[PDB]
Enzyme design. Structure first.
Site, mmCIF file in Angstrom:
data_model
loop_
_atom_site.group_PDB
_atom_site.id
_atom_site.type_symbol
_atom_site.label_atom_id
_atom_site.label_comp_id
_atom_site.label_asym_id
_atom_site.label_seq_id
_atom_site.Cartn_x
_atom_site.Cartn_y
_atom_site.Cartn_z
ATOM 1 N N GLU A 174 -14.673 -9.974 -17.092
ATOM 2 C CA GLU A 174 -15.745 -10.927 -17.410
ATOM 3 C C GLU A 174 -15.403 -12.056 -18.375
ATOM 4 O O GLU A 174 -15.838 -13.224 -18.214
ATOM 5 C CB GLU A 174 -16.919 -10.146 -18.016
ATOM 6 C CG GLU A 174 -17.732 -9.316 -16.987
ATOM 7 C CD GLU A 174 -18.474 -10.173 -15.992
ATOM 8 O OE1 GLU A 174 -18.769 -11.359 -16.122
ATOM 9 O OE2 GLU A 174 -18.673 -9.529 -14.883
ATOM 10 N N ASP A 215 -18.526 -20.211 -19.532
ATOM 11 C CA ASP A 215 -18.428 -21.626 -19.221
ATOM 12 C C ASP A 215 -19.622 -22.359 -18.657
ATOM 13 O O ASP A 215 -19.610 -23.581 -18.643
ATOM 14 C CB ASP A 215 -17.323 -22.011 -18.259
ATOM 15 C CG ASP A 215 -15.946 -21.551 -18.560
ATOM 16 O OD1 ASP A 215 -15.551 -21.214 -19.667
ATOM 17 O OD2 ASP A 215 -15.193 -21.677 -17.491
#
Length: 185
Positions: A73, A86
């Site tokens: 992750e 992000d």
């Protein structure tokens, strides 16, 4: 202790798809690629080892599974910005999605890993109910796949990862987890 939901060592895996490996800079795919990626994240992972193991022991889930999710992750926090992914939706080492669950704790603490692990366990339980003729370890696999794509996406054992990110979620995670297990997690 840590075995209530299965043993990662007993799960079959095809590891990382090329969709996952390439971008990580590898020229090969599969189980060995998964393990290599896992190894690149070990030192960063080690920073949280105690906590990972404490949470696994508390919730009766293998710490190596938590570590495997962490690697996949967030690369053990390396690709995060103040705990955020992000796109700004995932938070923490385990990337809890703010759109589905309000995030609890600091991004790299016991509260967070607890929350993420709890979500995982809930997916495991759902799969156990959904396919009660599977073995415990198969169920663990399905629970991990669901962590990425939801329970609805798990319709069979063989094609569970189709539809997950890179079509390899659980296979990858499990391969990473097997590396971790070997390293004291």
């Amino acid at each position: 202790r840590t075995d209530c939901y299965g043993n990662v060592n007993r799960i079959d895996t095809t590891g990382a798809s090329c969709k996952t490996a390439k971008p990580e800079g590898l020229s090969y795919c599969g189980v060995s690629a998964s393990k290599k990626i896992a190894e690149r994240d070990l030192q960063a992972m080690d920073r949280y080892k105690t906590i990972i193991k404490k949470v696994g022991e508390k919730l009766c889930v293998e710490p190596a599974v938590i570590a495997g999710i962490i690697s996949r992750e967030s690369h053990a926090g390396k690709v995060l910005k103040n705990g955020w992914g992000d796109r700004g939706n995932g938070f923490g080492l385990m990337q809890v999605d703010k759109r589905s669950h309000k995030p609890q704790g600091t991004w790299n603490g016991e509260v967070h890993i607890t929350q993420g692990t709890t979500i995982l366990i809930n997916f495991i339980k759902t799969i156990q109910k959904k396919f009660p003729s599977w073995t415990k370890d198969q169920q663990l696999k399905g629970g991990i796949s669901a962590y990425n794509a939801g329970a609805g996406n798990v319709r069979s054992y063989a094609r569970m990862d189709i539809g997950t990110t890179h079509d390899d979620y659980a296979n990858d995670v499990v391969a990473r987890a097997q590396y971790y297990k070997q390293h004291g997690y």
